[PDB]
Design a protein around this ligand. Structure first.
Ligand SMILES: CCCCCCCC/C=C\CCCCCCCC(=O)O[C@@H](COC(=O)CCCCCCCCCCCCCCC)COP(=O)([O-])OCC[N+](C)(C)C
Ligand SMILES: CCCCCCCC/C=C\CCCCCCCC(=O)O[C@@H](COC(=O)CCCCCCCCCCCCCCC)COP(=O)([O-])OCC[N+](C)(C)C
Ligand SMILES: CCCCCCCCCCCCCCCCCCCC(=O)O[C@H](COC(=O)CCCCCCCCCCCCCC)COP(=O)(O)OCCN
Ligand SMILES: CCCCCCCCCCCCCCCCCCCC(=O)O[C@H](COC(=O)CCCCCCCCCCCCCC)COP(=O)(O)OCCN
Ligand SMILES: CCCCCCCC/C=C\CCCCCCCC(=O)OC[C@H](CO)OC(=O)CCCCCCCCCCCCCCC
Ligand SMILES: CCCCCCCC/C=C\CCCCCCCC(=O)OC[C@H](CO)OC(=O)CCCCCCCCCCCCCCC
Ligand SMILES: CC(C)CCC[C@@H](C)[C@H]1CC[C@H]2[C@@H]3CC=C4C[C@@H](OC(=O)CCC(=O)O)CC[C@]4(C)[C@H]3CC[C@]12C
Ligand SMILES: CC(C)CCC[C@@H](C)[C@H]1CC[C@H]2[C@@H]3CC=C4C[C@@H](OC(=O)CCC(=O)O)CC[C@]4(C)[C@H]3CC[C@]12C
Ligand SMILES: [Ca+2]
Ligand SMILES: [Ca+2]
Ligand SMILES: [Zn+2]
Ligand SMILES: [Zn+2]
Ligand SMILES: [Zn+2]
Lengths: 675, 55, 675
């Protein structure tokens, strides 16, 4: 028996106010008029009476979209505050125009009429409001130590965050950008960048800021989509405040703008400069032409040096031929790196400091060219973006290992004279370190070729997904390294008392890299190595067996080894499978825009004159007219976009409501004509 | 008023006998009562602490 | 310049027919009347004129849902054939009633009005048609060699298939089952079973028949869902043409009907017969009670034998206690099987024919009980469903291996007298075969416990998914066995010339089960074994190396081994991963209905009196009233279902169309009143 009563009692109005509110809601030109006259004379009705469910007389008159009752209430001095916002949110032009011609609320007090109009994204209401000289407060910069931001955040943090989000939502509407900004493309780019960088700062309101940034990027892409000619697209892309706006969009990570089909057409025509209709030809003749131009890599580079402006000197200046020549030079470098480890060119293996062979003497200009190119990349173009590549770390590692190999070879040549057999050299002979670093640099140089996958149409998205899933490999190795450190600590602590010597063990071998694996858990480094190698099954089971008859210690060690194997394989590897499968499933939707953005960024790196020579040969010693043309193009694009959007806003629901309103008005007019 | 649903673990006669005589009607009545009590409007009107009532 | 003309010219009517058709379409009581009078007198208008887009005057009058023009056209002798079907498909009651009161077509000639009414599933139209004494032709049985089916399929197969599908779609409508059938539950069960079995026969029209079977099953479940009392549910489930209708639904594989919550309540109350509120208690006290009743398994079975109808004799007759006693007896059997291979009970290991030990003497009554229970299961209950279990094959294998072990032990006892050490016994000594078959039967008996997973709430759907993915394991092993046979044939053909002898090889071992693996590909059986064991990495790499210096043969053999490893692991295992992941994703939706059906089928196997004793102790020596009650229950359920369905058929579209029709009729009536 649960008793049910209204615990929050609302002060109900008198019966005289109910008649006035019912006359307002039903709609009557005479009953409301005489009710207001009686309220003026006898004071029977409070004019500012309000329903318990937040509905004043003016709000109900707005909800009925009738202008006569609204005009009479406006002339009868009804409380008009917080009533234009309801008409704006209802999105009716007549009521907003009438209220602009002159307690409880459903809107937060920081909302202005222009802000709500921008939130509702109605073109006519926003235009009619901005004609009345309205302004929006400027949101502050993200990192503020000023008093006006810090004190406001300290006093009322929720109101501050709500006000900032409301302002940024008002500024990000496509209609307000199309009306109030003279450069909607650059405004959309900038607002998308600020909203994306601000979503990470305000990590709790991340979804709304990400949605607003996506809205701005979509508006920029849709504004570019309305181009009806190649001249308009060339004017858009070449506008400088060669392809300036495309470089700006690449800077602001506008992947949807970059991967637009007409932008990709213009980039493809600029890429195949010397080949009219490269996509037209057969794949066999394309492969033959690519092979010929690649095999002509000593050519077209000497000709550039001896005659830059000849018939043949301008052949390498085209971007595709430049890319082919660079790829051919790198493949030739890797071929000589393969040839450097062969018996035909490498002899006299028992000298402490050897002079370089012919293959290494040929390798040296390539290494100097790579070093000089990476040095020039630090200066030319800039330094703040050189580290913002994530491929230049690999190049820096390659060049550092090359320099270390060269320096160690020089030291071993100048301080070691004579010959000595290789078995009696010391552990840290400079020659051995040089041969190790050269091999590591060979691995890095041959793995550098993955960056060329974005040019191909089939290996590009594959490399994009490879990066996507390496981002989760990086997360998985933290848990794996914690588990590895835990079990290594435990196993070394259990097993370090039974450490033997290399002399006692057979073949003078102490470690897990022997025929009979010895001292697998004796030291912490060897324990880490053993627990790493047990993942691939290369650690045998008898390494947990000690010389003495300590069967309890052996059993506890084998149990630790089995628990580590279970945790590190059965749980963790299949967890990694599930993680990468989920990440691949998410990225497979947006996998072609990313590849097209990466391919575009690779294409614009070959457009400029800098770095024309391959690394073998790169070490051998009025604005008003453009602004007005862009302004006409923007005017046409904005008009086309606003027309397409304004009738794409026509909806079955709104059309149906409009038809009922027109039918009701016409029936009432016909009834008044008959009566 | 709405009848109060019993506690989950009842050995009382009024619950056990009702479940024995007609189990389907008993389960339907309990589910209907708990569906009536869980509506947001009834919590907003009849309860003075809607947050704790919802919890 | 592609010329565009109408290649299929349609004979357009004269301008006099256009006026008549426009007057019919617009709606005019006077223009159509005078047009028909002029057509009667001057023969200016053909009354049966037809639009090019398949629209006669009567069809347009049907589309306008106006009965006056339809009545005048009916009185004016307009061609009425193939016009009731349009009114039925449009689903308007008045036009169908009026046309029932008296070239090109959009309907196939095998469609009758009752069949189209059943296809549209409108209750009022189906009722109004079945009141007029209509019949539906009976579809034939699935396997017909009769002339009337074979000749019709030979002359016109497409028409025959379309007619059969149309008839079965008309018979499967819920409204026709609710009206024309006195037992809608049994009719829905039977029709669902025939449609499911006919979907596999007509493998091309499989989707439609499967959809119709699902529709019938959904109708049966929804008819059961309208029960408002436990008495009605007990009347439904106990109706015999104890739980008879539940057994019928289990026979017809009605998983949705079985897994209904009220059926599961009734089954759960019948299952926990001696425990009022088993789900109420704590899990600890539940485990303690289950452990006590299980450990009392010698008890409650001797008491059943000495006093079946005592206080304690009826305790095991309850289903849950019977299940607990059976599980305890099986676990005790497995415990003695574990004890049989221990040194405490097994001694004198060098006798050719041993007498049985005490553990095997205790095992023998259990084996005889299992054999007698499986023999009784063949006779009691039936034989045609004993093979339709897929668990009785395992039981038959266990009992056959048990019988073979007993017979071999008897033979080895009666023909081998004396003692001999185990190393000089022959390869096929009967004792060794007995010990092998006993171990295989031990493996099978301990793996038999998987069938008890459906009782638990967490391991049931897991076993359902295990069966789901074993169904794809079975598909994968065909490709794997084909690849294995191919590579085994190739490797044996390459390597059989270098076969050695066991004497020449070290330790007199010839095979891959030695310390040094020898002759891995010498014979076809050993090649199959080697290629099987290479999947788990237990085949070493030096088995591809021969004694002679035939490096080309060794290289080709190693290349075959590597290709087999790549195909059988990198492609095939990850393909199997993808297949089972997809199958698990599909079955994870319908994974709880399957488990509840399996748990119900396990529960009804303990309800009957047969097999009350555990296998240790099972070898020790008026219908009119029920029909009328069921008829009242069906009447109430059908009325509730048809009310719920008939206003669930109310839709925004139909209500909106009805409101426009009423508004148009009222406005026309008001205009006629004014005029
Ligand atoms: C990423 C960016 C950085 C890349 C690396 C830049 C630096 C590169 C190369 C410089 C390496 C150090 C100087 C070696 C010569 C000097 C010397 O006497 O060394 C002493 C110490 O030698 C060592 O401890 C060996 C260090 C090998 C580092 C290999 C890194 C490979 C990274 C792979 C990454 C994939 C010799 O021994 P001793 O003390 O005489 O006894
Ligand atoms: C599934 C349903 C069927 C189940 C099995 C029913 C039959 C069971 C058992 C009967 C086995 C055959 C009779 C053995 C004794 C007779 C005899 O002399 O055998 C001779 C041949 O022996 C063989 O060839 C060994 C056959 C072993 C079969 C094992 C099947 C295991 C199935 C596991 C499945 C998981 C002895 O050798 P020789 O010729 O003297 O030389
Ligand atoms: C004593 C020690 C002995 C050691 C012996 C073994 C040596 C092993 C050497 C090799 C080590 C691993 C090398 C991996 C190379 C590939 C890296 C991933 C490539 C890839 O697909 O992702 C790219 C990132 O690569 C990158 O970010 C490149 C990372 C390069 C790291 C180099 C470290 C040195 C994406 O491309 P993107 O970066 O343009 O994506 C957009 C901007 N984020
Ligand atoms: C010289 C030879 C030496 C051999 C030595 C090795 C011997 C190995 C013995 C073990 C072989 C494998 C045994 C597998 C047992 C489990 C089978 C699957 C169980 C499962 O989850 O699926 C059930 C089917 O099982 C079934 O259908 C049971 C299949 C039993 C096959 C027994 C063959 C003998 C589903 O349950 P459900 O069938 O009720 O599903 C509804 C009606 N379809
Ligand atoms: C960190 C991330 C969370 C991990 C949470 C835990 C995960 C499960 C851990 C399971 C540990 C099992 C240890 C078994 C062990 O040491 O055996 C070697 C030792 C070797 O002596 O085994 C024994 O001593 C017992 C012999 C029977 C082993 C039965 C193993 C049952 C579980 C199997 C799991 C699947 C494989
Ligand atoms: C049946 C189902 C469809 C199968 C279709 C084919 C699938 C791919 C087959 C690939 C065969 C590769 C054979 C390699 C081989 O024999 O190596 C052993 C032999 C051993 O001598 O290798 C060689 O002789 C060459 C050494 C380099 C091997 C490079 C292998 C590249 C491909 C790797 C794939 C991933 C692992
Ligand atoms: C499988 C083994 C033999 C590979 C050995 C390494 C190289 C010989 C391969 C690896 C990556 C390959 C590259 C991957 C992608 C491309 C881009 C591709 O670009 C185009 O097709 C041009 C048109 C466009 O840019 O879309 C031209 C071949 C090339 C340089 C490939 C040349 C050959 C490379 C360097
Ligand atoms: C992990 C190792 C130690 C398992 C060794 C084998 C047995 C000791 C296990 C395997 C399967 C188990 C069974 C799995 C499922 C069930 C059903 C379960 O049923 C209930 O909970 C009763 C209520 C209901 O029917 O829903 C009772 C325990 C039982 C028989 C389990 C008893 C113990 C079993 C036989
Ligand atoms: Ca670089
Ligand atoms: Ca059985
Ligand atoms: Zn600030
Ligand atoms: Zn109670
Ligand atoms: Zn027939």
């Amino acid at each position: 028996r649960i008793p049910l009563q209204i615990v929050r009692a609302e002060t109900e109005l008198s019966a005289e106010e109910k008649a006035f509110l019912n006359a307002v809601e039903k709609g009557d030109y005479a009953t409301v008029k005489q009710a207001l006259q009686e309220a003026e004379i006898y004071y029977n009705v409070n004019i500012n009476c309000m329903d318990p469910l937040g509905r004043s007389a003016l709000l109900i008159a707005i909800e009925n979209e009738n202008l006569e009752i609204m005009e009479l209430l406006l002339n009868h001095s009804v409380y008009v505050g917080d009533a234009l916002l309801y008409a704006i949110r209802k999105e009716v032009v007549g009521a907003v125009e009438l209220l602009l011609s002159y307690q409880f609320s459903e809107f937060t007090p920081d909302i202005t009429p222009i802000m709500l109009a921008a939130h509702t994204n109605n073109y006519e209401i926003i235009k009619l409001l901005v004609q009345k000289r309205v302004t929006i407060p400027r949101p502050h910069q993200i990192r503020c130590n000023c008093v006006e931001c810090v004190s406001s955040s300290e006093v009322d943090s929720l109101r501050h965050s709500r006000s900032r989000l409301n302002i940024y939502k008002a500024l990000a509407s496509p209609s307000l950008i199309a009306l109030s900004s003279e450069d909607p493309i650059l405004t959309a780019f900038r607002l998308g960048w600020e909203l994306k960088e601000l979503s990470k700062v305000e990590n709790e309101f991340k979804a709304e800021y990400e949605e607003l940034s996506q809205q701005c990027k979509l508006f920029a892409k849709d504004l570019l989509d309305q181009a009806r000619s190649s001249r308009e697209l060339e004017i858009i892309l070449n506008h400088r405040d060669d392809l300036a706006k495309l470089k700006v969009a690449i800077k602001y990570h506008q992947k949807e703008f970059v991967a637009q089909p007409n932008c990709q057409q213009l980039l493809a025509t600029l890429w195949y400069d010397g080949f009219p209709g490269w996509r037209r030809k057969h794949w066999v003749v394309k492969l033959l032409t690519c092979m010929t131009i690649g095999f002509l890599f000593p050519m077209l580079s000497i000709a550039y040096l001896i005659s830059p402006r000849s018939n043949l000197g301008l052949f390498i200046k085209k971007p595709f031929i430049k890319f082919i020549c660079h790829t051919a030079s790198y493949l030739t470098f890797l071929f000589m790196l393969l040839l450097a480890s062969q018996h035909i060119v490498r002899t006299d293996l028992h000298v402490q400091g050897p002079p370089p062979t012919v293959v290494e003497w040929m390798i040296l200009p390539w290494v100097l060219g790579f070093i000089w190119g990476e040095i020039k990349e630090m200066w030319d173009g800039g330094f703040t973006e050189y580290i913002h590549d994530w491929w230049n770390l690999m190049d820096f590692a390659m060049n550092s290992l090359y320099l270390a190999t060269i320096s160690l070879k020089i030291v071993a040549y100048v301080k070691y004279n004579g010959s000595r057999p290789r078995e009696e050299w010391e552990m840290w002979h400079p020659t051995l370190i040089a041969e190790a670093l050269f091999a590591i640099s060979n691995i890095l140089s041959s793995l550098r070729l993955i960056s060329l996958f974005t040019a191909n149409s089939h290996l590009g998205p594959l490399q994009i997904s490879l990066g996507r899933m390496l981002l989760d490999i990086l997360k998985f190795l933290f848990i794996y390294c914690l588990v590895l450190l835990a079990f290594a600590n435990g196993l070394n602590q259990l097993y370090f008392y039974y450490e033997t010597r290399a002399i006692d063990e057979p073949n003078n071998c102490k470690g897990i890299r022997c025929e009979k694996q010895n001292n697998a858990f004796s030291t912490l480094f060897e324990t880490l190595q053993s627990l790493f190698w047990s993942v691939f099954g290369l650690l045998n089971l008898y390494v947990t067996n000690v010389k003495a008859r300590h069967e309890f210690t052996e059993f506890v060690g084998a149990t630790m080894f089995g628990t580590y194997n279970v945790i590190s394989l059965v749980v963790l590897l299949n967890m990694l499978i599930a993680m990468m499968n989920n990440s691949y499933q998410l990225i497979a939707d947006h996998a072609d825009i990313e590849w097209k953005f990466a391919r575009t960024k690779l294409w614009m790196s070959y457009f400029d004159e800098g770095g024309t020579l391959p690394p073998p040969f790169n070490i051998i010693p009025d604005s008003l007219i453009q602004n007005q043309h862009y302004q006409e193009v923007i005017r046409n694009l904005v008009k086309r976009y606003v027309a397409a959007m304004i009738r794409n806003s026509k909806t079955h629901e709104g059309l149906t409501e409009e038809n009922f309103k027109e039918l009701k008005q016409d029936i009432s007019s016909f009834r008044y004509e008959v009566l």
